[PDB]
Design a protein around this nucleic acid. Sequence first.
DNA 1: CCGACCGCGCATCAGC
DNA 2: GCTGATGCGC
DNA 3: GTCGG
Length: 326
Amino acid sequence: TLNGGITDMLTELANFEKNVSQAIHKYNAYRKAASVIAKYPHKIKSGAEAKKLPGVGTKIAEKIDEFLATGKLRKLEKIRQDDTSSSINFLTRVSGIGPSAARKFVDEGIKTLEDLRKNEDKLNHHQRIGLKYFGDFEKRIPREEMLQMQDIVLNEVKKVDSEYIATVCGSFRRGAESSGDMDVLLTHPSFTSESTKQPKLLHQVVEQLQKVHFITDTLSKGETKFMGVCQLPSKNDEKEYPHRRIDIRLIPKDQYYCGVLGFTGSDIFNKNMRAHALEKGFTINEYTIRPLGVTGVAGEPLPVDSEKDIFDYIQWKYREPKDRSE
DNA sequence: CCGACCGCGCATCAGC
DNA sequence: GCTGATGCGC
DNA sequence: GTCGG
Ligand SMILES: Nc1nc2c(ncn2[C@@H]2O[C@H](COP(=O)(O)OP(=O)(O)OP(=O)(O)O)[C@@H](O)[C@H]2O)c(=O)[nH]1
Ligand SMILES: [Cl-]
Ligand SMILES: [Mn+2]
Ligand SMILES: [Mn+2]
Ligand SMILES: [Mn+2]
Ligand SMILES: [Mn+2]
Ligand SMILES: [Mn+2]
Ligand code: NA
Ligand code: NA
Ligand code: NA
């Protein structure tokens, strides 16, 4: 919170560039600046000071000066009063309505929550579910509920087959006291980088979590990635818990460490690490780290027996999950 | 200045 | 049906 | 929008 005013402004700018301008590198540039400012341990007193940080350049330095002086940014005040940008920014908050869809909907006169409900027939399945749970998906998840959810998932998985290992990653693994959603990494010894000896490995887990009325809806589902909705069960006479977003990802068991690194994040932390891995002659995905050739083509996967091994290849001192919240 | 910016699974669409 | 591009949410 | 080269 030391610089919460600045990082909020930059985040609002990033969202503007993503949703309205459809300018993805400006989006990430603003996100990058906001992340580096967010870990800087002094109350920023000027844009000159801010600009010393990697990722804060001249333009962001200017806007920091304006904000530090007036407590506002004219550019944002203008954006806020623009009805089209306003409507687009709102509509994108629905899961499945991206910048493209949102602009299309506004053009057709669909620009409020009321309009969206009136026109359910024009939403695809993902968007229909995002709208259905729009309000619930706004709420955060106390870690205590995350712990309850972990228990249901880990226990229900164990019931399908004792050799499933399910790990909760995401902000939960980084030690967050509240989470936007739940992210689950799934492995099973019959699914390795060398063979898939068992079919329906993910489907069986989804059906099981559905049978016990944990998973209530499905956003998308393939042979290795599920995205949907779940809900803790409520006690006798208790108000119902909010519906929550859940993702489950099945990974080859011999590639667990790149996977848990990849699904622990943060998203910015991954971008930073992967970018630095390129600079040191490697490419990292959620499956492998591979060396780059003189041309650029990736080599064969390098051996990995721990998260730290990946850090070692790229000349990075190890960082605990709790220190990867960028 | 200029070129690169992490890397991927699923849903949907256009084309053959 | 298959292949590739695009949107989307990560 | 920023930064290495
Ligand atoms: N490589 C990469 N990984 C991502 C990206 N976005 C999300 N992830 C991974 O997916 C994990 C879960 O994503 P989210 O649920 O949106 O993020 P989160 O850190 O869990 O935050 P909350 O759920 O809102 O508390 C992240 O921690 C990352 O490990 C991305 O843009 N690139
Ligand atoms: Cl851009
Ligand atoms: Mn999450
Ligand atoms: Mn998630
Ligand atoms: Mn039932
Ligand atoms: Mn609900
Ligand atoms: Mn580096
Ligand atoms: Na800088
Ligand atoms: Na959206
Ligand atoms: Na979220």
